Design a protein around this nucleic acid. Structure first.
Length: 92
DNA sequence: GGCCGCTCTAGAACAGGATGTATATATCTGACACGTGCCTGGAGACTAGGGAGTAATCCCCTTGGCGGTTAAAACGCGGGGGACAGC
């Protein structure tokens, strides 16, 4: 992930998009989600690493700060699984 | 076209980290006792001279007695002032 994001984007990773890779949607989360929310999450994880979920959610350039919770559906485990899928798909 | 397997989500359990408190253990602190080494004083030895002790005699002082006189002490009595208790 860091190699590909540097390789194209490094001039500014805020340029990043997942592009032609079309991910499967989130399953009925309490928040609407798209390739855009995925892309912003990926840029977050690039800036702050995996599992930095407080910083990932808090960074306002990602626009996440509303969409992700501390029994509302998506949480750290769901975020982890989503990242696992997204990176597996992009590496595929 | 149908059913089962696989994947994801949800719940439950366990462990670790974080924080505060209590308890046990270690360390310090001090004084005494013993050992060691060195130096000084005491102990031992010997001599000479002075002081103390001993003896005798004489003189002065102290103790005891007598007598008289005078002053002091003791006994007595009354009144006043001070001391004591109270408030």
């Amino acid at each position: 992930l860091k190699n590909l994001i540097n390789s194209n984007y490094k001039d500014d990773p805020l340029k990043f998009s997942l592009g032609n890779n079309t991910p499967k949607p989130v399953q009925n989360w309490s928040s609407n989600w798209t390739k855009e929310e995925d892309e912003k999450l990926l840029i977050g994880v690039f800036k702050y690493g995996y599992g930095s979920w407080t910083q990932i959610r808090d960074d306002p350039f990602l626009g996440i700060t509303d969409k992700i919770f501390l029994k509302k559906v998506p949480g750290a485990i769901h975020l982890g699984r989503r990242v696992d899928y997204l990176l597996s798909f992009l590496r595929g």
